[PDB]
Amino acid sequence: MRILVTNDDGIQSKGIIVLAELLSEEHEVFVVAPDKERSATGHSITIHVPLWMKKVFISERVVAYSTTGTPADCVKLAYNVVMDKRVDLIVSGVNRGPNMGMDILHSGTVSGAMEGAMMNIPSIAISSANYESPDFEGAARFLIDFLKEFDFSLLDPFTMLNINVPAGEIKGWRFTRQSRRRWNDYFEERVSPFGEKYYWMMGEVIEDDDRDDVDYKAVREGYVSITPIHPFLTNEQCLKKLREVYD
Amino acid sequence: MRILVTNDDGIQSKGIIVLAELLSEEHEVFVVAPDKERSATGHSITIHVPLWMKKVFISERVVAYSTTGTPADCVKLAYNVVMDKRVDLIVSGVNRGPNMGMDILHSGTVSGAMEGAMMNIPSIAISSANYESPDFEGAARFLIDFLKEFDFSLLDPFTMLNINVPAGEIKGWRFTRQSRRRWNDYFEERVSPFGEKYYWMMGEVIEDDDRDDVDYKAVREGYVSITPIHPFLTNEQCLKKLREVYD
Ligand SMILES: [Ca+2]
Ligand SMILES: [Ca+2]
Numbered sequence: 388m389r390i391l392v393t394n395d396d397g398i399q400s401k402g403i404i405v406l407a408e409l410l411s412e413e414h415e416v417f418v419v420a421p422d423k424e425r426s427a428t429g430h431s432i433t434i435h436v437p438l439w440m441k442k443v444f445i446s447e448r449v450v451a452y453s454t455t456g457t458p459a460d461c462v463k464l465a466y467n468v469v470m471d472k473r474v475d476l477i478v479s480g481v482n483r484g485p486n487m488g489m490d491i492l493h494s495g496t497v498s499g500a501m502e503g504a505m506m507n508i509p510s511i512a513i514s515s516a517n518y519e520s521p522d523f524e525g526a527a528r529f530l531i532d533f534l535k536e537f538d539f540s541l542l543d544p545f546t547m548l549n550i551n552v553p554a555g556e557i558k559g560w561r562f563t564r565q566s567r568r569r570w571n572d573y574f575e576e577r578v579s580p581f582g583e584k585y586y587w588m589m590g591e592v593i594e595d596d597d598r599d600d601v602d603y604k605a606v607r608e609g610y611v612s613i614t615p616i617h618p619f620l621t622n623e624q625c626l627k628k629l630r631e632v633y634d
Numbered sequence: 635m636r637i638l639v640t641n642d643d644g645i646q647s648k649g650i651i652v653l654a655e656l657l658s659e660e661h662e663v664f665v666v667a668p669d670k671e672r673s674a675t676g677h678s679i680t681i682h683v684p685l686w687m688k689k690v691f692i693s694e695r696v697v698a699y700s701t702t703g704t705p706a707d708c709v710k711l712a713y714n715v716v717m718d719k720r721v722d723l724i725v726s727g728v729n730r731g732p733n734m735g736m737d738i739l740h741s742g743t744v745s746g747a748m749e750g751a752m753m754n755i756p757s758i759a760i761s762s763a764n765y766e767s768p769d770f771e772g773a774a775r776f777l778i779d780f781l782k783e784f785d786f787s788l789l790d791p792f793t794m795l796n797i798n799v800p801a802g803e804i805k806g807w808r809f810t811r812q813s814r815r816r817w818n819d820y821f822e823e824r825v826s827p828f829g830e831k832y833y834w835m836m837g838e839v840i841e842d843d844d845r846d847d848v849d850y851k852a853v854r855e856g857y858v859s860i861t862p863i864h865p866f867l868t869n870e871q872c873l874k875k876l877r878e879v880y881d
Contacts, residue, residue: 471754474792506787 388414388475391503393461394482395425395495398453402451402481402515404445405523411448412476412517419465421495422453430498431457438464458499466506476534477503480513485551487516487602487612488568492619497549497616503615504547505618509539511547516606517554529611533560542615551602551612558609565614566601569593635722639665641729642672642742645690649728649762652770656778657725658695665692666712668742669700677745679706687711687733705746713753724750728773729761732798734849734859735815743794745795745861752865756786757794763853764801773799776858780807789862797879798849798859807858813848816840 390410398420410416412426422441438456445451452469454461458479466474479499491497500538503510515521529552542548549565568571572590579585594603602612637657641650654665664737686702688796699716701708714720726746733741743759749788750757759778762768776799789795796812819837826832841850849859 471791473754506783508787 389473390416390461390469391413391465391470391474391477392416392418392449393420393458393465393477393499395421395428395458395479395499396483397421397423398445398451400444400483402521402523402526403431406449406481406527406530407449407479407512408446409511409524409527410424411446412505413531416449417451417462417470418451418471419440419461420451420453421461423456425457425495427493428457429493430501432459432463433457438467440464450455453483454456458495459502462499462502466508474503474508475506476514476539477510478530479503479511480522480550481521481530481552482512482514484514484518484521485516485603485606486512486549487551487606488566488570488596490570491549491565491616500547500549501616501618504545504616506543509537509542511550513552516551516612520554522552522554524556525557528569529557543617546615546617546618549602549612549614549616551606553606553609556609557611559611560607560613561600561605561610563600563602563605563612564598564617565602566594566596566598568596568601592629593600609617624634635661636717636720637661637663638709638712638717638721639663640667640705640712640724640726640746642668642675642705642726643730644668644670644672645692645698647730648767649730649770649773651692652697653725653728653774653777654698655693655711656774658693659778661691664712664717665690665696666716666847667700667707667799668705668708669702672704672742673739673740674738675704675745677706678704679710682705685711687715690800691755691852705742706749709746709749709753709819713755721750721755723797724755724757725760725777726750726758727760727772727797728761728799730761730768731761731765732850733759733761733796734798734851734853735813737816738796738812744796747796748863748865751792751794754791756789758797759794760797760799762801763781763798764769767801769799769801771802772804776807778803780858780860782872790864793862793864794865796849796859796861796863798853799859800856803856804858805856807860808847808852810847810849810852810861811845812857812861812863813841813843813845813850814849815843823842 500510500512567576570590729743747757747759817837821833
């Protein structure tokens, strides 16, 4: 299987290296990731200026390239220029920290995998749900096992898998829905040497989902959270109501 | 989009001119076709003798060249010496007459596109389903409209689309599978002036497909037939059984 590995922390990140090396023992792995920190870049793409790539070494077992673009740019470039449109699976990660709730909208890790979903290529965004003490190997090992037990034909079109792995013990797998986890974010105001004020974004997490099958609850219980998501944001319930009211 | 256009009827065929002209209205078109009739040449290529090319005129925006080779040779030449290995799409046609069932194996039109598939370049073979009232403009116009509605990421690697446009009115299009339409060939015997007999190949068509989603049935109904085909001929079903018995 020809696998494309990418991430949003940079090609030199420990999370992507372990993932690539472990996947290289059984598959043909191609790594195309950002040449710098791309966390919180969401699904941004580069259209105003050109993109550049650089061949880098990360293992004699894998073909690697860094690009001046975003995670989504990396997937487009890998697909069209590095892998000759021959990609069997796309894995974006392993990210240091969780990617759950509404945070996935600005997640670079998720965007990489989503670009794959948009092309109907089986894709997975994988994150170690513990920023402080991440377990890249455990997440990678879990993935290798998942690839042997999961049947990707069950994946509907334009659908990818957003995966969050507990850092401690993995007590099992659980298919979940995206939660509404978000933040009470504010700003820390400060003053620069030249007398101009500046702001630092800060925040406290909000976990107020009443539903029992959401992503963070599963992870909280030591269970890997596997959420099938697609690039469609329509609020059907609301749409139906707006119509039965006007038109 | 850098598009390569070829055929099996010769660069002077009305079928290829109409097609190249329309595609140029919004695409960088290059035409590399045979300098002579090449219908029924299948996937033959020129390896025993040299290949020659000749600059030809068709449009002020379209770069054209005829060659002494087959449709397949044309694609190899076009790609390596005319388009600097930069081809986004290959379209072969528009052919005068259908290309469905087993007949696609000896079709020069199909082979032009199949060579592109072998080189892993998105390719399309397009034919007007009526030999006697062909409709080159209709077939070409359908393709232009189809391109605006087709997602090339869904066209697997080494795969091409074999398209047959019915003559007359198009009710719509369908993604079909290759049928087993074929011919019961035979020969009419005749004698030359010098007393030696010769044979003229003739034949009656055989249409005995029980499946409803095959190419010719869609065409008969007034629908464009679109079949995704590739250069892989293994009979998996037969192979499976052979391995079960000779394990
Ligand atoms: Ca990150
Ligand atoms: Ca022909």
